[model samples]
Target: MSFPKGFLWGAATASYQIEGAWNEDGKGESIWDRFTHQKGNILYGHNGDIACDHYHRFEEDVLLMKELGLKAYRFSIAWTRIFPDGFGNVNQKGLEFYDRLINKLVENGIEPVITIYHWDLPQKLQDIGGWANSEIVNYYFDYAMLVINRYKDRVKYWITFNEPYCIAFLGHWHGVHAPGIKDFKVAIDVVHNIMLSHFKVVKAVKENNIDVEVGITLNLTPVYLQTERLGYKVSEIEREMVNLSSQLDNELFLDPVLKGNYPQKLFDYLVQKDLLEAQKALSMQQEVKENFIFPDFLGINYYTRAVRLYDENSSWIFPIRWEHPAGEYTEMGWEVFPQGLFDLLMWIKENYPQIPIYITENGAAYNDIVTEDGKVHDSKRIEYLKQHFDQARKAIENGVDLRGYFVWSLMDNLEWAMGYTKRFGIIYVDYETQKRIKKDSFYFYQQYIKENS
Candidate 1:
């Protein structure tokens, strides 16, 4: 019934989804602003031009964070806001805004946790090539050094990027998020570039004596195989293969940073599939071999599990098919599997025992509906938190050095292509009036945090 004495209890939000100042105070455009404004991109033609209106309402939001008894708040900075072109000139007004926000959080007795990049690539960078261009790695390092030197005295915990998996695969491979593009080769390059950028940023901060804790957040789902049918042996084998392939993505990037080497089996598998050409494979192997660096901690973001199967004859990527789990699911149709969290944490400890970990983002979206009396009864989200918190406690009991757990979002805002249609925040935001409503889950989380404390 207790967490470590200083476990961080907080909520998270990205600047693009919450700040809403797409072009305020010398701020330049971001890939999301461009991607959403384009016709036929974001769901319902919705964008975050005025999302949550947090840009002008940081004081109110900070009060809400304190009201929730949150010890920490994880928020992202708009890269364009700081460096309008992603590099070069500094934006004093942009820095001023974050300075005010961070100071306000401190005044309210809340720790500010800043994530340098959260898939909000500056449109200027995307103009030539976003993550695909290897030069962006140096761009990111320079920007990171700027932010650290500016706020390292106030902010100690810094998240380098929120969910590189989504930034690389979802943004490039699936084309579901910003700067949408769908090319397999491009996606592979993005995967490598983003990791390289992360390594460079970590190194820069370390060498500069920033005295900041650097971490990366990755969205992950525990993959499970369906074994309900008697003649499902083929499906079972396919499921296992797909799971292995899925894990290789994280391991491929994480091993170099944490374990200092790529898993040999995964490297060979990619080579066999021609995903890695012989020359390119050798080059990549050497780059990872020589430039790898370990992070201070690993941040894992969990939501659901994938039930996947691979069919060689199928035409899908990896020839993999997927299904839903047989339990409750969220508005996103993601399964409610808290036990998966326990399994994932233990797996990490067993495989990479030396690295400490944290749950950087974890929460559910319900079809939130407000009553005439002005209350949003999102019982589904409340249940989701309770179940997951129980599982997190179980993991800690089982010796998973889980440092902290942050809810996915503090307030409902734009949900990428899904737009505002899917609400994941504990506090509901009325897009029209910009009114904030604290759902039952918000109060429930506050009580849980107090009790645990």
Candidate 2:
């Protein structure tokens, strides 16, 4: 099985996860810098202070990508680097760093896809309530304009935000990631404000009249009933409940951006749970509008399928709970379900056929170790990627309008709050010595790309 001609094969990385000159060269503090530094916040008490040292060693990293014959690379820009306090004097050094990086990628014949925001909000902005504060909407747009204008000449593909769902739910409602808060109302407000910011950014990119493709990446998962019996015997009420819950997961972000309106079920659910009042007040104060902007492409970051069961005693607005069925799981404990990718792709094609799609991020984390011969064998990851690639090809054959696929990462770097405990890269990074070793999976991917090409 091979991809069509011109199908992009690349890898992706985030600013905070890879570039680790956290405070050097006029770079200001990000919410992650503060969150990871607090004791007992991250696993093993580890922080991303020197992640892959990519800030200093990016030249070498680019050479690695070139060696792998990558056709494209998806990465994020550090907002704090551009505007230290979220908005102020521009940092020449910070700008220069990305300038060098982009030039190097172009020099190697690699298409560069830039993600404007990847969850590393400027610390100053977080201090002012981050995405929850209505003021941040404009601050984000200002940052977007600066980067878009600066890189408009060379960079043609732009992503406004990596995953709005994670930025809103994980950081705000779950309290696991940076700028952690545990308020449902704050999460709802964040969803509303972040979408507004995204629309404005996309509008800015179009208004500039630059020949660029702009979109947002969403981490969407397929939701399934726990058992076939449940699926077959689902009553009308149960089906409605499941459908509403499913739409809330993916459509919450997709509908606002594509359709310019939130799902009616979602609005009704929030109102029933008393969370809609606060969001209503926020909408008035923030002047939030249902501004819809169709993207040049829709970026999807599919990881696994979510098997859910109805819970009668649940207190949440969505009365469904996620369950772990017996299956192979990644080091992150996420189930290995390649069919989920095909399921999600078909859903996108059925609902939003006008927008083309790209598999923005897809990979697995596993415990990795370098062998005595200085070689890393990561056969599991290779198999995992192969299964998903096959699914992607199947989706394309089934008329899904799939365009490209980017592996989750090029090298193993910081795994966010899990710290460096999980490895999710085709290339292995020896964090202790700052050495990079190509794992077996790396060679497999290179050969696959070659054969497909």
Candidate 3:
């Protein structure tokens, strides 16, 4: 139950899942590198172009995140490597490979965080209709003011977009990720044009003054209701219609960025389905008070929790029925739950009690093996990250201001369309000689970051 004192032991990934030079230096093409080279997209045709080659082994993956004491890392920046055509120009070798991976994570004392946009849109911004052309909110505020005027003196935690509910309802209304597209009203206007392109890159990284700390990365789950009979009344109406369609795509994209507006039952169910008539005739209420500005924290990413049930004569969209209640499931089957990380950090500190969160992406993907002395034993992801770090030390001893956690990936990359056949690393890549080993949950998170430092 102790943390707060510099509490941030991290680790996360996704530069197209471990860089792979996706089209090298002048990089471009990333709606997952053209949805994993098209033909029956991904699954074992796997691709990150060359994953774990981590764009030429990112200085041996920053010496394995400084040998796993990782006080902070949270990657992701490949918008086709700095606009390779997502917008205008600028590619100084794709911004000098993230300025040499943020000066090798501040020369290994770690702490970088980044993110900018993880669901890699940049197939020239999905060729014009990406996030349904809301001019991608000024092309994501000119790519968040060119990454806060180029890594604003060594990256101080930016983020601005990672999940937008799997980039607008599982990649545009459930086509199963990437620019797949199934179009439930264009995934409900690509979830309000990707939260107005993450509140115009959170007001262009705070109007370019940028000492940066902005945030956005939701993957929350907390849903359950499985039984009441009648074969579980459609699992309690699909657990309240997948918890009100995942709070209208993640807490209604955090009520116009942390409560400025939106979500009066999602603006009365998009003006009773007339769907906020062209954002209420172009510029409605100053675009909901410029996305009700609010930040300074809240990243979260928890993994399990489903048990839903609502099948009003099934047909997807919310005919819900998840139910994996036994235990130990992952290899993509999911359900390891850890009390869904202590009830999603006490329901975001009893309902967003002034932001301040972070777990950013917990891990789990076990089917790992690699022995013959090359060593790679993943003891059930070390008892699923010590039961979610003892449910994040019981939600930081019940108060839950919970500043950090990271984890979900530091190695075994490329897992989008199940590429690299699911591995959720604690180190262990070897994708045929791109090698890397360190397992046993990376020496139990490097002795839980040397006994929590």
Candidate 4:
């Protein structure tokens, strides 16, 4: 019922999601800033211009983390902060901001786990085609060196990038996130370059000899077939659909980085869509394959599972439809299934057991309300966390090398394209007055950590 010795318990936040003052203190613009400003991009015309006011209020936030009994905190550094134009003159004020923040976290007995890039590309970089352009790879390496060289002494835990899948696919192919574009070839190219950039950054960090434990955080979801009935023809089609989905979701990033080779299924999927020539051109560059580095740990961000069924009405390489069966769903409409986490952990253990793992991000969103008694009662979130924590313990008992769990967020802030509507925080934020109120789940997590200790 308890975690192993030295297990980490913490909360997570992103630079753009929590820290406002987007244009302050020599901070350059990011793609999110430009994307949200354009008409019809973000919902309700909401942007993260003043999210949580964490830029000026981080000292108070650190005190809140201390009161919650958190052993660690996972946060990201904005690349634009250090290199305002992606790669040019260094921003001293921007570097000083993170220096002060990390010092505060360490002073309060909380370990700082720094994620290098968290979906916030500098606007200048995006102006020149962002990840799709191969030149940004070196720019990304330069930004990485600027950050690690400055803070390598204070922070020991580092994550190179948070969810490259979302950064590439959701941003480029689906056109949902920042730098919105809907070209399939561009998406494939972005994935290749992002992986290459990740490899170079990991190499840079290790070669620096900072005695740091570094990894990348992947948002992995378990995929399940819809039905068990199997006609011979339908079964084969279903199997192909499953394989293609797995290639896109799991193998596209994991295979090349962890296994040191690209998945053949992914290459075939691209070829099926008449993009094989582009894939071949990228493969011949030798940047992605030659620079792979085995990470010290694997950070898995599990939220929900995808139940897929082959659809006849679709016209894509992977013609599958997602189904939400009768079940509890989160505010994001994601099904609330804790077994997916256990299954994902087992899959990683079966395939890549060389590295230890951390639950980098996990939590649910709900329409929270503060009662007259001056407390926000978020029992749904409490149950959600408890069930997932139980599943995590089950994974550990089954011989999975799970090391830590950091909640999705420390407090409510901007929810990206969904804007400020989704609340995924253990602590409630009153945006009207910029107030912080501890929800019931906050107390629940504190007691849970105390008992585990």
Candidate 5:
């Protein structure tokens, strides 16, 4: 069986990754702009000062998408680009860039899926406490309202945020991403404020009385228990252990946005570990209960499944023994596990039933190089997409109510901290000359899209 007719087929890109006009047209500095400018924040001292030059070459990129038979395009708007000061003053020039891009996509028979924020917070906002401060929730809502008001007529799909888990745990907890800070307390607070902002924006967007579909894109990794490592059937204790870990990684975000509550068991486990104070945990749970609102849809950026074991000798309180089972690993060191996508889809269908879903970001990174023949050939990425696409189709046949799918990236751009070393785009980018080369995977995807339609 094939996908249901009219299922959206597209690819995604983010402003900081592709647009590359860091401060050309009244664009204020973003946390990423500041972080990358630091001497050693990015790999090989790489920064997005002039990434794929999409800001200057978006028309060329759009025509390439048109040639690839893209039915839609999902991209995030830069917050600093719009407000310049984060809130007080509006930057008309910054708004005109997106206005032009949206109009071009609409004219080319392609739908626009807008991600309101994709981890590019303005440096001004970060200066005043960032997402960790609940006051920033109003600022986020204002940014969303301004963009929606400008592009509401042309855009039907709006995703509030992309991958809050990474924004919180990776950026704040691990201190790997921009505005990096490694404090568990600040991490949890950042997560709560982001969800509150999601709720706030969703409510306001709906109150505007428009026909747009609103949702948040979460990088939901399906965590797997390493049964072989455990060497036995799961006991009740092990089952609860698996659930607790999942509670922290998955449900901590999902429960509030999808189920209208927080993961009580997760916080209870955290309290026992002394990672989260009992009283503070209680406050967060209560806050989620009060502010939670179900989104119109859920955007899941499923890349790979995480295999974990419960090791008693573990040094940390959580006792999560991470493992890399024998599998093909990507350039990012992520395993190529296609079946995880189907299982993840079913898990959401069973647990958070009735909400429509989309695979907002799913693609692999590889070390791509231009051969002497002048064509970039990447067979591994082709196989990766084929297997993942099969899993998505399987989920649909099993009644997942899957609405659409957007590849992780539309073209090769900066890969954030890893910088330009990892290539995730189907369309290869020649950084030296800023040339665009359609890889073998791009042709494969293009033909597949045509056949499916």
Candidate 6:
């Protein structure tokens, strides 16, 4: 299989992960700023307070993208940067920072794909219950309108929100990510509000312009059955586990926007558990089915798939946690299953039907090292990319509406809770000196795009 012409190729980075300068230039505190400073939220007490310093060095970074032959670049806007207190007044200084970054990308012949919000919520919003509060949806729409109007001419692609699952679950339900809170009700409310804001932003973009594309990015992974030791036949319990895993991890977040409905498993669990009041529950489901305007595309952040083993001791809808299959795993300990990417593509092709899909974030974290020669010879990373790219090519041949692909990151930066412990970038970053060294995978990606395009 081969790539079609005009297939977009680029890399991605989140604002809080890369754009350090937190609390500078009238920028207010974000949940991450508050969370990371709480002593033990991040590994080694390493916060993103000084991340990659992309705030001041975007020109240098954009040139690296140009050198890598990127057709487009996907990066996020820090909510606090634009709306310092998450609402009241606009911050010119913050807007100026992005102006420089966007202008540099344009001059380098790179398309800009803007993510409206990417986990770095304003602490002000969190103080008022954040996404769980319905009012925050309106606040988000106002911010979205401002940014969309500001850069509509230059940026043609806009991703309304990145990984709502993490926003609703990781940050809210599991209490592991920023603004951590462990409550099923809060998580479900956050999910509802996220869908509403997405609908509003997508509607706004479509009404305001016809050329620009708008969508949401989800951290989606395929769930597989864990085979028993012998006689590969699957049991009824395993199929039930798979169904619950898919609903919780993938479809709960996906179905509302794409299918205008909820998964039966998730809906039943919510009702069975009495997670919401009858009135509230009916309204939540009604809002999703009645109010969606449908986005132009779907941005899937895929790294690996989920293979689950049911436990008798578990009490949740499905297993609370799962294990990797017998295969290669990344530094993050995620199974390296490129075939799963193809499986996911086919699943979406058959289920969602017509929505155009983009691989907005896909890359592996590796234990990369710079040799004495000042070069990173990361063969493992290169092989991982090759396998994934081949799967993408296969999807295109198999009649999937795969629009484009963006590597997980443009460079090594603060990896959220993991901090700087894991490196997922093709360009290796020296934390102490902030020097960016192009890895072997960077050249591999560059040449692959050059040849394929």
The local lDDT score (0 to 100) that residue 152 gets in candidate 1 is 88
- What is the per-residue lDDT of model 6 for residues 1-453, given as tens digits with 9 covering 90 to 100? 777778889899999999899989999999999999998788999999889999988889999899899999999999899899998999999999988889899999999999999999899999999998999999999999898888888999999999999998889888889898898788988989999999988887777665789999998888876665334888787777668767888898888889877676767766776765566677877888887877889999999987676676777655545765588889999989999899999999998849889999999999998899989998998999999999999999999988799998889999999999999999998989988899999999999989987
lDDT string for model 3 (211-301, tens) is 7788888877776666642343443444556666556645766666677565565455556556456455345346767566677897988
Tens-place lDDT per residue, model 5, 106-127, is 9999999999999899999999
Candidate 1 lands at a TM-score of 0.96
Candidate RMSDs in Å, in order, are 1.9, 1.8, 19.9, 1.8, 1.3, 1.5
Off by over 4 Å in 1: 228-240
The lDDT of each candidate is 0.84, 0.87, 0.77, 0.88, 0.89, 0.88
Could you tell which candidate, 3 or 6, scores higher by TM-score? 6
1-453 per-residue lDDT for model 4 (tens digits)? 569988989999999999999999888999999999998988899998899999999999999999999989999998878888998899999989999999999899999999999999999999999999999989988888777777778887899889999998899988999899888788878888888888888887678676788899999988987764222244787778777877788877778779777777667667767865654645734665678888888898999998877886876567888777788998899999999999999998898647899999999999999999989989999999999999999999999988899998899989999999999999899988999999999999999999986
TM-score of each: 0.96, 0.96, 0.32, 0.96, 0.98, 0.97
Tell me the tens digit of each residue's lDDT in model 2 across 364-414: 998998999999888899999999999999998998888899998899989
Model 6, CA-based lDDT:
0.88
Q: Best candidate per lDDT, number? A: 5
TM-score of 3: 0.32
RMSD of 5: 1.3
Candidates 5 and 6 compared: the better one by TM-score is: 5
The better-scoring model by lDDT among 3 and 4 is 4
For residue 180, model 5's alpha carbon misses the true position, in angstroms, by: 0.9
Could you tally the backbone clashes for each prediction?
0, 0, 5, 0, 0, 0
**What are the runs in model 5 whose C-alpha is more than 4 Å off?**
228-231
**Candidate 6: residue 259 Cα off by (Å):** 1.3
How far does residue 228 in candidate 5 sit from its true spot (Å)?
5.0
Determine which window of 10 residues in candidate 3 has minimal summed lDDT. Answer: 228-237
Indicate the residue-level lDDT of 29 in model 3: 84
